[PDB]
Design a protein around this ligand. Structure first.
Ligand SMILES: O=C[C@@H](O)[C@@H](O)[C@H](O)[C@H](O)CO
Ligand SMILES: OC[C@H]1O[C@@H](O)[C@@H](O)[C@@H](O)[C@@H]1O
Length: 391
């Protein structure tokens, strides 16, 4: 820590409190429950938009973590509102687990069960349990864990997509050329993340074993040894469908794996994981940090130098984490300058807005929604919360 790091945290706390929190408070749907599901680039909310379960759970996580860190009573009420919509509309009373999507009124639109959705449910419900003490939220998280472990897990990871009644299906995520990816970095990273939070709160043996198991899967199958990159979209045997590098996923997995490593009881694996996380952060700085911000991805030989909101948020956390473990100032410098880029190019200058989805290579804003099933307060809100907690 120093004077720059302290002012850094203060700046992120003010941004979260004066920009992020009140923006997402304005998305609260008091007519039907939950949160409005879409806001276009011109800041027009579509109150009738379908509501994604992942978005609701990320909002639940965000407001819960805000209460847990800042003790804001309004944030706890905002989390309650999202918990109520999860409980009443996304949770399947008959077969259990969480639907994929519902209408703005809460009518089930896509009742299939995806591990990606269940994991985010565990993440938000456990966070909300810490904030509220609600035993029903704790029950749902535990049941989601047992379902994942007893119905969805396989020898080499999770089957990712299921019918409503948990009969397995082929996956819904597709490679760039339309081949089904039976194994995705996406799903398994958020299983890891949700299990870390669950174990941190519960400290249960069964949960520890599943956490260690998923950490090992990342070390043994998903990580591309010696490259600093993880596989993104795979067949059922963790063979890449395409040579693809997501620098955003790399740097996020870097600090998430580092985080889980703190709980590991096998000291060899723990040293392994901490070395992996730093190898990834080192490669990421060298290959994807342009001196200003992080580029997006490389698909085969095509580089996308767009600046995506969640990539830069995770870059700030990942590089700050790398700085904390090494004390090498190149990482701290990179994290702060990425924050300075976000402030100048991704924080919307129009009133009553939040963060732009992306700017292109030429730093031009691109027409993309401000709120969508995949654009949430989770990444950028967690960026602020992490720095607040770490400094
Ligand atoms: O398609 C993109 C998303 O499903 C995620 O892959 C992405 O990393 C962020 O989570 C955006 O929400
Ligand atoms: O690769 C296809 C296979 O991938 C698995 O993970 C499951 O989704 C199976 O239902 C499917 O047959």
């Amino acid at each position: 820590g120093s004077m720059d790091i302290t002012r850094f945290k203060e700046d992120l706390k003010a941004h979260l409190e004066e920009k992020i929190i009140p923006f997402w408070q304005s998305l609260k749907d008091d007519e039907f429950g939950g949160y409005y599901g879409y806001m276009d680039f011109n800041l027009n909310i579509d109150r009738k938009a379908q509501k994604g379960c992942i978005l609701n759970s990320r909002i639940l996580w965000f407001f819960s973590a805000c209460y847990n860190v800042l003790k804001s009573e309004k944030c706890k009420e905002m989390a309650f509102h999202a918990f109520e919509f999860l409980k009443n509309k996304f949770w399947d009373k008959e077969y259990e687990g969480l639907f994929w999507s519902v209408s703005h009124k809460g009518v089930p639109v896509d009742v299939t069960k995806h591990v990606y959705v269940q994991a985010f449910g565990i993440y938000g419900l456990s966070e909300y349990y810490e904030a509220s003490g609600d035993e029903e939220a704790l029950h749902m998280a535990k049941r989601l864990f047992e379902i994942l472990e007893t119905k969805c897990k396989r020898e080499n990871g999770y089957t990712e997509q299921f019918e409503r009644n948990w009969q397995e299906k082929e996956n819904r995520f597709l490679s760039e050329n339309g081949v089904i990816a039976s194994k995705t970095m996406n799903t398994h990273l958020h299983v890891l993340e949700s299990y870390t939070n669950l174990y941190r709160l519960l400290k249960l043996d069964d949960v520890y074993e599943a956490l260690e198991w998923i950490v090992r899967l990342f070390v043994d199958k998903i990580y591309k040894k010696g490259t600093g990159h993880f596989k993104v979209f795979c067949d059922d045997n963790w063979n890449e469908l395409i040579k693809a590098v997501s620098y955003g996923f790399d740097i996020e997995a870097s600090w998430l794996l580092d985080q889980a490593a703190k709980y590991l009881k096998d000291e060899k694996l723990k040293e392994e994981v901490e070395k992996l996380a730093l190898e990834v952060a080192q490669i990421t700085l060298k290959e994807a940090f342009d001196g200003q911000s992080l580029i997006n991805e490389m698909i085969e030989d095509r580089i996308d130098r767009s600046k995506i909101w969640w990539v830069e948020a995770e870059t700030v956390v990942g590089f700050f984490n790398a700085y904390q473990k090494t004390k090498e100032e190149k990482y701290l410098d990179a994290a702060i300058k990425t924050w300075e880029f976000i402030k100048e190019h991704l924080v919307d200058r129009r009133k009553n807005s939040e963060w732009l989805w992306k700017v292109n290579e030429d730093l031009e804003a691109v027409n993309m929604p401000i709120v969508e099933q995949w654009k949430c307060p989770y990444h950028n809100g967690r960026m602020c919360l992490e720095i607040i907690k770490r400094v």
